[PDB]
Nucleic acid binder design. Sequence first.
DNA 1: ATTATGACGCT
DNA 2: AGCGTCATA
Length: 430
Amino acid sequence: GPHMATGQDRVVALVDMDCFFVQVEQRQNPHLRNKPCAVVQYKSWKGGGIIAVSYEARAFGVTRSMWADDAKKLCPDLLLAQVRESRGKANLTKYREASVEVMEIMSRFAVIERASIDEAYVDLTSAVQERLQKLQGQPISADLLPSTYIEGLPQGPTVQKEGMRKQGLFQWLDSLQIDNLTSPDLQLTVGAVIVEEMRAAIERETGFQCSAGISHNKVLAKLACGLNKPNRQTLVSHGSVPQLFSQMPIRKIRSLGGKLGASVIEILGIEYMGELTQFTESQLQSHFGEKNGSWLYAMCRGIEHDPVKPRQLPKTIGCSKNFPGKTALATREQVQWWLLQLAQELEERLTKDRNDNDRVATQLVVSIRVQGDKRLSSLRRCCALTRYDAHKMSHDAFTVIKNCNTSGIQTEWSPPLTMLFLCATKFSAS
DNA sequence: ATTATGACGCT
DNA sequence: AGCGTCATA
Ligand SMILES: [Ca+2]
Ligand SMILES: [Mg+2]
């Protein structure tokens, strides 16, 4: 009744750069702009592996994870940009630096949580209150929301995309109660005005475009963001939830895309998020555990309480390289040489991190995969990280893994190694 | 022979 | 701690 929480206490946005690595390359090379293009890493094996795809290329069916040779079969005029190679491996520095550009702009508007290289959650609750005070009961013009979609509208009693967008928006604004500074729908609307402003600033100052979701929590924000891409933003209101979830496959919800989501579907015999409402919280907790059960019970009603964490910097800095099929490392000299390459990239990134961010990593995590193991990682071991020195780190890493060598010969490595990983963690202020 | 990342949960 | 899950370019 009057005591039933509705999860409308916050305004949260998720901003996500459109085909990010592609835009980075297109900014640098104007010849790639407005073309079907992709970003690829390496090149020898089947033309390279695609990691990002422009919307023009996606129309031909080009996807992430596709080999470039195969992509060219779908899209013969596909243009490509290659990821930089340093010390024998892919080097993502250019994209990490572009990311900082965007995050520093978003941080001017609100506290952000860096969710990935190209997305951040924004807690707009306080900013919306402020903006609402400046507004003085004054209505919000459709003009302040030029790229906004209202999920669920238009409805009820134009055949062009942009025209539908506007019809929906008009219905929404026609129905807003603006004299009420606590209306959740109004709050979301003002949130969308601010995100329009954030997105304009990002584009003006970087050249990069993005999409965004505006809702009452991170999960709905994230879902909303993907509803209208690219270069658009979507408002998912509390009210839109029942209809949106009634046909929303469970795997679409963040955290439900893997094994848990599959078990929810299998155990409960349902397909869609909204079907979850028919189970009690205790039923859900019985199948999926106490925490997941409570989470699912609230989430299928559009309610979620995870905070936007005040964190703009990554918590770890890592370097990894796969050594697939025949290239697997089978000698001690090999393993040592590659540990050094990885350690050298890591030292470089750690030193920059210390100068920029006033912190020092204190733990080195070492991880390898051995040929045969189905798991991505076969073994993880940590040691102390007392000095930013690549020779030291690679030596320490070899020490912690050197006994994974089954070989009776000192110089041979069996089973061969198909992945090496160095990660610096546990930062302290400096 | 996707690859290179990065966060957080479990015991 | 070391392992597994889930996610993104
Ligand atoms: Ca993106
Ligand atoms: Mg993303």
